[PDB]
Amino acid sequence: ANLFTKVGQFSVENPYKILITTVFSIFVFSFIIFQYATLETDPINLWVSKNSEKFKEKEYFDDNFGPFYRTEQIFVVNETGPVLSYETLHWWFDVENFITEELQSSENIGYQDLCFRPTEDSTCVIESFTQYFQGALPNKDSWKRELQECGKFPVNCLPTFQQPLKTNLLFSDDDILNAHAFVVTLLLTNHTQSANRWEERLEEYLLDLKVPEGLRISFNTEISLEKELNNNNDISTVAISYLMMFLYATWALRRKDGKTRLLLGISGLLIVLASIVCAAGFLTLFGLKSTLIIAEVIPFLILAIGIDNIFLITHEYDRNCEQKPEYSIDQKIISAIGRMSPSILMSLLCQTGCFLIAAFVTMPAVHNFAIYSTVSVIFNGVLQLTAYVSILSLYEKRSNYKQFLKTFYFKMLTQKRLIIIIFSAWFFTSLVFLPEIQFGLDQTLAVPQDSYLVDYFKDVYSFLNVGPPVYMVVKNLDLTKRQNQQKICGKFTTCERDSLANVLEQERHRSTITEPLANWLDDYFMFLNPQNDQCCRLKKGTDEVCPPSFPSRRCETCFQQGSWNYNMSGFPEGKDFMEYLSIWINAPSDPCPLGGRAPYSTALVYNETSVSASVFRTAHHPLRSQKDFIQAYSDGVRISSSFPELDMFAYSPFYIFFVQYQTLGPLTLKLIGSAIILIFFISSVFLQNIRSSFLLALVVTMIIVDIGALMALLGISLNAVSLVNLIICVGLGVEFCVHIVRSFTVVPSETKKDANSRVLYSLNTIGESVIKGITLTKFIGVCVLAFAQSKIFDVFYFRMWFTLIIVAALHALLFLPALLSLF
Ligand SMILES: CC(C)CCC[C@@H](C)[C@H]1CC[C@H]2[C@@H]3CC=C4C[C@@H](OC(=O)CCC(=O)O)CC[C@]4(C)[C@H]3CC[C@]12C
Ligand SMILES: *[C@@H]1O[C@H](CO)[C@@H](O[C@@H]2O[C@H](CO)[C@@H](O)[C@H](O)[C@H]2NC(C)=O)[C@H](O)[C@H]1NC(C)=O
Ligand SMILES: *[C@@H]1O[C@H](CO)[C@@H](O)[C@H](O)[C@H]1NC(C)=O
Ligand SMILES: *[C@@H]1O[C@H](CO)[C@@H](O)[C@H](O)[C@H]1NC(C)=O
Ligand SMILES: *[C@@H]1O[C@H](CO)[C@@H](O)[C@H](O)[C@H]1NC(C)=O
Numbered sequence: 175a176n177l178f179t180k181v182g183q184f185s186v187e188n189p190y191k192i193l194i195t196t197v198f199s200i201f202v203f204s205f206i207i208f209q210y211a212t213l214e215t216d217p218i219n220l221w222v223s224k225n226s227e228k229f230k231e232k233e234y235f236d237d238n239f240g241p242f243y244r245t246e247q248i249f250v251v252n253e254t255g256p257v258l259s260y261e262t263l264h265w266w267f268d269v270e271n272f273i274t275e276e277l278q279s280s281e282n283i284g285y286q287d288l289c290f291r292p293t294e295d296s297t298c299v300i301e302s303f304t305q306y307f308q309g310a311l312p313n314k315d316s317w318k319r320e321l322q323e324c325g326k327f328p329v330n331c332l333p334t335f336q337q338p339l340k341t342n343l344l345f346s347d348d349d350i351l352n353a354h355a356f357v358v359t360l361l362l363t364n365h366t367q368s369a370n371r372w373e374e375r376l377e378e379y380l381l382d383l384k385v386p387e388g389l390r391i392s393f394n395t396e397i398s399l400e401k402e403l404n405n406n407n408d409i410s411t412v413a414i415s416y417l418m419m420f421l422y423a424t425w426a427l428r429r430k431d432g433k434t435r436l437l438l439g440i441s442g443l444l445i446v447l448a449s450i451v452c453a454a455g456f457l458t459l460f461g462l463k464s465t466l467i468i469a470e471v472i473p474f475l476i477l478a479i480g481i482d483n484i485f486l487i488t489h490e491y492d493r494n495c496e497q498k499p500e501y502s503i504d505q506k507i508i509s510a511i512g513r514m515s516p517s518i519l520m521s522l523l524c525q526t527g528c529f530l531i532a533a534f535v536t537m538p539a540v541h542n543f544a545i546y547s548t549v550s551v552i553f554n555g556v557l558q559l560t561a562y563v564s565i566l567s568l569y570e571k572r573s574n575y576k577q578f579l580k581t582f583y584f585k586m587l588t589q590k591r592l593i594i595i596i597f598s599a600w601f602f603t604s605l606v607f608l609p610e611i612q613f614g615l616d617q618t619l620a621v622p623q624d625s626y627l628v629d630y631f632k633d634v635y636s637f638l639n640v641g642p643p644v645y646m647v648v649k650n651l652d653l654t655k656r657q658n659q660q661k662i663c664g665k666f667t668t669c670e671r672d673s674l675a676n677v678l679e680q681e682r683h684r685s686t687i688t689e690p691l692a693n694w695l696d697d698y699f700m701f702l703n704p705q706n707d708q709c710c711r712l713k714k715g716t717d718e719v720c721p722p723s724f725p726s727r728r729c730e731t732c733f734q735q736g737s738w739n740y741n742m743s744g745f746p747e748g749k750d751f752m753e754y755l756s757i758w759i760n761a762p763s764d765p766c767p768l769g770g771r772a773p774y775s776t777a778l779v780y781n782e783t784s785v786s787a788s789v790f791r792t793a794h795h796p797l798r799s800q801k802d803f804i805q806a807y808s809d810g811v812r813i814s815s816s817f818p819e820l821d822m823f824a825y826s827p828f829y830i831f832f833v834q835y836q837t838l839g840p841l842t843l844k845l846i847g848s849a850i851i852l853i854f855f856i857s858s859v860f861l862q863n864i865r866s867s868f869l870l871a872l873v874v875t876m877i878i879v880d881i882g883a884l885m886a887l888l889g890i891s892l893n894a895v896s897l898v899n900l901i902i903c904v905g906l907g908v909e910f911c912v913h914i915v916r917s918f919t920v921v922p923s924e925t926k927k928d929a930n931s932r933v934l935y936s937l938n939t940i941g942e943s944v945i946k947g948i949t950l951t952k953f954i955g956v957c958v959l960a961f962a963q964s965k966i967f968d969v970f971y972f973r974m975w976f977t978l979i980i981v982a983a984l985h986a987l988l989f990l991p992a993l994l995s996l997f
Contacts, residue, residue, distance in 0.1 A: 175860070178515035179508060181556075182563045186504045189564030196561045200448045203455025211454070214463035215404040220539035221894075222830040229833075235647060235825045238779045239789050242643075242827045243290055244362035244369055244396040246376060249633035251355040251390045258321070258351055260314055265386055267311045270304050270358060277379060279372035288364035288372055292772045297334040301359035303344045305333035318351060325350045336763065336772060346637035355637040362396070373397045381626065392629035402625045404466055406963050412473045415958045416443055419477060422954055426946050427488055429575060430496070441565040442484040446477050448561070449554035456549055467543040467895075470967050471959070475547060475902075478955025478975070479525065480554040482909065483518050484562055485947030486940075490514050491566065495577050503570045507563060517916045520860040521909045522555045527852050528905030531845055532898040537834065540894040547902075583937040586988060587930065593992040597985065601876045604883035611886045613835045614800025615893040619965040641794030644687055644810060645825040646674065649787040653695065654751040656742060661819060662790075665696045668742045677816050678792065685809040686802070689793040694774040699745060701758045701768035704731045704738050709766035710757055719757050722765060732757070752783060794826070800891065807832040834894050842897050849904040850875055857912075863919050869993055870908070870915045873985050877907040880981050881974065888973055895970045903978040909948055910982035911990055913940040918994050933994045941987070949983045 185192050214220060222229055235242075250257055250266060274285040289298035300309070306324040307317075324331035325348070328338035347353035362369050373395040380393045423439035450473055454464065490510035494501065501509065526548055533544040586593065621627045653659045660668055664675025675693050682688045701709045710732035711720035720729035732754055737744035746754050759778060761769030779787040794806045810824035834841075850871055857867035881903055890896060917936035921927070925935045952975070959972035 175516050175519060178519055178559050179512040181559050182511040182515075183508050185560045185563040186507055186567040189568050192560050192564040193568075196448065196557065200451055203452045206455040206458045207451065210458050212458075212463050213404070213469075214465045214539070214542070215400050217399050217403060218830065219463075220403075220465055221537055223536035223538065223833065226536065226830070226833045228829045231647070231823050231825055232830055234649075235645065235789075238787050239645070239647075239776060240363065241365050244288075244365065244373070246360040246362070246373060246393070246395045247630070247634075248358040248360075248380065248391060248393040249355050249630065249637060250358070250385075251392070251633060251637070252388065253354065253390065254388075255354065256352050257355055257389065258318075258353065260317060262386060262389060263317060264311060266358075267304055267309070269383065270300075270302060271309055273376060273379065274298060274300055274360065277372070277375060279368070279375040281368060281371060283368045283372055285360065285362075285372070288362040288369050290361035290363045292335055292337060293775065296336065296772075299335045299337065299361050300333070301339060301343055301357070301361070303339075303350075303356050304358075305335075305339060306331040308334050321350055340640075342639040346639060348639075353637075355633065357638060370397055374401075377401070390629070392626060392633045394627060394630045398627055398630075399621070402621045402627045405625070406466065406470065406622060408470060408963060411958050411961065415474060415477060415955065416447075418954050418957075419443055419481060419951070422950065423481065423484070426485055426950075430492060430577060431575075433575070435569065435573075437565065437569045438484075438488060441562060441569075442481055443477075445484070445557045445561050446480040446554065449480055449550050449557055450476050452553045452557075453546060453549035456553070457546060462542060462545065464546065465539045465542055466964075467539055468546050470962060470964070471543065471971055472546055472550060474956050474959055474971075475975075476550045476554060476955075478952045479551070479906070479909070480558075481951050481955070482947050483555070483558045485951065486514055486518065486913075486943055487511060487558070487562070488566065489943050489947060491570075495575075504567060507567055507570075511559070511563065516860050517913050518555075520856060520916075521912045522551065523856055524853060524908040524912070525551045525905045527856065528849050528901050531849050531852065532901040534845060535834075535841070535894050535898055537894040540898050544898055580938060583934060583941065583991075587933065587991060587995060590992040590995050593988055594996065597876065597989040597992075601879055604876075604880045607883035607886045608879065611882060612800070612889075612891045613804055613838055613893065614891045615895060615966070615970075616800060616891070619969055622963040623965055624963070635798040639796055641686070641689075641796050641806065642826045642828050643791060643793045646678070646691070646790035646792065646822060647787060647825055648674070648790065648820055648822040650821045651785075651788075653785050653788075654748050656745065656747055659695060659745075659751075660742065661817075662693070662695045663699065663742075664693065665700065666740055666742050672816075674790065674817060674820065674822070678790075678813070681809070681813055685813065686794045686797070686806040687792050687809055687813065688795045692773065692777075692791040694770060694777050694788060694790065697768055697770055697774065698755060698758045699742075701761070701766065701770065702733050702738060702746070702754060703768075704733045704735050706766060706768060707731060709761065709768050710754060717753075719760075722762070749783070752780070752785075755780070755785070756782075803828060803832050804835045808836065811836060838892060838894075838897070842892060842900070845897065845901055846878060846904060849901055850878070853904070853908055857908075857915075861916060861919050865997075866915050866919045866994075869990075869997065870911055873911055873990050873993060874904060874907045876989070877910075877978070877982050877985050878904055880985075881977055884977050884981070885974065888977065890969055890973055893970075895966065896974065899970060899974045903974060903982075906952070906975070906978050907982040907985075910944065910979075910986040913944060913948075914986055914990050915994070930995045933991045936994075937991060944983075944986060949979060952979050 278284050286298060291298065303321065306321060312320055325341040328340055332338055341348050341350060344357055345353040346355040374397060377395045377398060380391065383391065385391050420439055420443055423442055424434050424436060427438045428434045487510055491507050494506040494510050529544045529548040529551065533541050535541055618628050618631045651658050660670050660673065662674045663669040664673055664679060669676060675691060675696065678691045703709065711729040712718060712732055713720055714728060714730045733744065759770045759774060761771055763769045763772045777789045778785055797803050797806050807829055810826060810829060814822060814824045853874055854867055854871040857870050858864050861867045878900065881900065914936050917939050918932045921932050921935050925931055956972055956975045960968045962968050
């Protein structure tokens with residue numbers, strides 16, 4: 175507590191060395207940012223913890239079964255009716271073929287060089303209704319009848335890549351002629367930069383595409399999210415915020431006579447700028463990467479809170495001018511610093527601690543923001559206690575100067591009991607609404623409102639009639655043994671009642687994973703059925719695969735009519751299992767439909783003696799909300815635990831982005847609870863009065879509880895961003911109440927020690943400072959976040975922090991005086 179007085183005392187005696195060091199420190203840090211600063215843009219690096227189980231499972235899936243396809247999805251929409259017409263078919267057939275056959279990317283790399291191919295000799299997989307006709311424009315008359323039958327019976331119109339396409343994948347309505355949209359999905363197995371270049375060319379192509387009148391297209395490339403997420407220009411917004419603060423600072427920092435002090439106003443804002451630069455340049459040396467949050471929020475948050483102590487010290491120093499006039503300018507600043515240091519330091523520590531508590535959230539972008547805010551707040555506090563004190567001493571010495579309201583503080587203290595009843599009811603009403611807070615972070619808010627991804631995300635929720643695929647990865651299961659393979663199959667009478675196939679079939683009518691499971695092990699055993707005389711043919715008298723050109727009577731089935739049984743009697747085991755597995759996983763699907771090459775060539779990781787890992791593919795039903803995604807993620811985790819005897823997990827591409835919600839609620843209670851107890855201990859050490867510290871913590875709890883209830887009423891979902899913002903609201907609320915509580919606790923001997931008198935003296939001392947130096951300054955800092963290009967910075971930052979200011983100010987200015995006079 176005395177180091178601030180010692181630090182401020184050193185600053186007044188050595189202002190130029192402090193000021194020279196400050197600019198030198200700023201210059202070097204700004205140089206580091208200029209040179210070594212890096213911006214993190216990858217969504218996975220921003221939202222996914224590298225140490226999460228889902229991330230590690232994604233690494234295993236990528237290494238063993240390749241990274242999931244790079245998906246480029248296009249929606250073509252007829253908002254007021256059906257989209258299918260020969261005019262639109264003629265247009266899209268030309269556009270669709272150009273994209274996949276003629277759209278070179280520079281480097282002369284097209285779709286054919288990057289597309290997914292089920293087999294090396296197959297064609298590109300294009301998930302579109304144009305593939306029902308093999309990418310050839312149908313007749314002007316028969317396209318309606320042909321398209322309907324193809325939707326009804328996909329097998330009858332198999333595409334050139336031999337994978338049937340269901341209408342729920344290609345359209346918005348199973349009634350194809352009435353569907354308002356049709357979906358086009360492009361899959362790329364290439365994961366090098368050449369794929370990135372082509373997707374950029376594809377993205378530029380679609381933005382410049384002339385859609386027919388009455389139609390509309392939304393799309394998404396694998397690079398779209400990264401490009402759109404980190405595509406913002408808010409330089410003017412920051413300047414506007416700092417100009418409004420400059421105008422307010424000039425008015426607030428003018429002398430009691432009414433004379434403006436421009437240097438003090440400018441210096442206070444320059445110190446805020448230095449705090450951001452010094453923190454950003456400091457964290458660069460540690461290799462920390464900034465993100466969109468740093469560019470879009472940090473200048474506003476630090477501006478909102480980095481200017482408060484300037485008013486508190488200057489206003490207190492102004493008070494030291496009228497009171498104790500014989501004191502010199504140096505002594506006035508030191509005395510003002512000394513008495514206001516305990517409240518400033520305690521609030522600073524609460525700000526520091528809450529940010530560090532918010533750093534326990536594992537989202538790197540959110541964790542990065544908390545760490546950046548922690549350094550900025552510490553840098554801001556040091557600068558205010560050294561740089562501003564040096565400037566204030568320099569300015570005041572050079573410019574020598576000779577020098578509602580209280581009525582409300584009495585009228586409101588007449589309604590102490592009524593005030594407590596109003597706020598007590600508000601807190602109790604708020605508790606009822608806490609269970610009503612919704613989880614999630616809508617993706618439309620994350621991207622700029624003008625982005626083309628906003629339309630695409632709406633189209634997915636509106637028109638996509640399929641859900642993300644789910645892969646059941648089973649590893650280290652010795653499938654050469656009958657017992658182990660009985661734990662997977664579901665087509666045979668000896669398979670366990672709780673086998674992978676059996677259990678998952680039950681979940682189809684009980685969970686979000688409602689699609690049939692592609693069981694390769696069942697297909698492999700079905701492929702061995704002697705009834706399938708065209709499957710598993712061996713040269714007679716030899717254990718060699720029958721050549722496809724070989725005619726009948728020159729080969730024999732791997733199994734005789736009496737060996738294969740539906741109770742798995744005679745099924746291959748040991749080395750025989752792997753012997754015929756090579757035959758099955760290489761057989762084409764043309765003569766034998768049960769051949770596992772096309773469907774399961776990449777579904778198995780194996781060698782000549784064992785299958786080390788394998789994949790069983792299913793999918794969720796269409797997920798059309800944050801609740802659906804959270805429930806879908808919950809189902810995957812729950813089902814993975816349904817097989818304690820299997821080293822297995824469920825993989826979906828979106829799982830990494832919804833890890834937090836599995837434990838968000840318990841984490842919110844733990845982190846916010848930890849923050850409030852931290853307030854109690856920090857307050858107790860400084861206030862040295864557990865009663866006052868308890869009431870301060872109690873009031874902060876009511877503010878946070880009320881904010882949480884208002885989040886439910888205001889439609890602010892709970893996620894990593896909201897949780898950290900709400901954790902910051904804990905620190906922000908403390909600053910609203912710390913000075914009121916401390917002034918009540920410590921009063922001069924001249925004033926009466928009565929509780930009512932102490933509350934009045936507190937309101938007649940810093941009540942103005944709380945309004946001018948905390949409340950109004952906070953609003954100006956974050957007000958422009960309401961107009962941010964991305965609605966996340968308005969929904970989850972402005973709305974929460976704007977609500978914090980109102981709720982905290984009401985509790986600090988009305989309830990807290992009543993809660994102090996009584997109790
Ligand atoms: C630096 C600040 C601005 C935070 C950045 C966080 C984003 C990288 C996160 C927040 C919400 C996330 C989204 C939440 C939900 C989804 C849906 C889900 O997508 C699918 O299942 C595919 C089909 C569909 O889009 O519905 C997974 C990706 C996505 C877009 C997520 C992508 C990553 C996002 C945009
Ligand atoms: C991703 O696509 C690139 C092409 O853009 C492939 O790289 C080519 O590979 C061939 C054969 O090795 C070379 O002759 C070309 O010079 C490469 N071109 C470029 C631009 O690098 C790459 O193989 C693809 N990725 C995978 C996994 O197949
Ligand atoms: C879009 O829907 C309206 C509603 O019937 C329809 O009249 C119009 O033709 C559609 N657009 C196209 C390009 O067909
Ligand atoms: C499996 O079925 C065959 C005939 O269908 C029968 O001979 C055999 O005993 C059955 N297996 C077992 C373990 O009973
Ligand atoms: C096959 O893979 C298994 C599991 O990884 C391993 O234990 C075994 O040594 C491998 N055998 C050969 C011949 O590669």
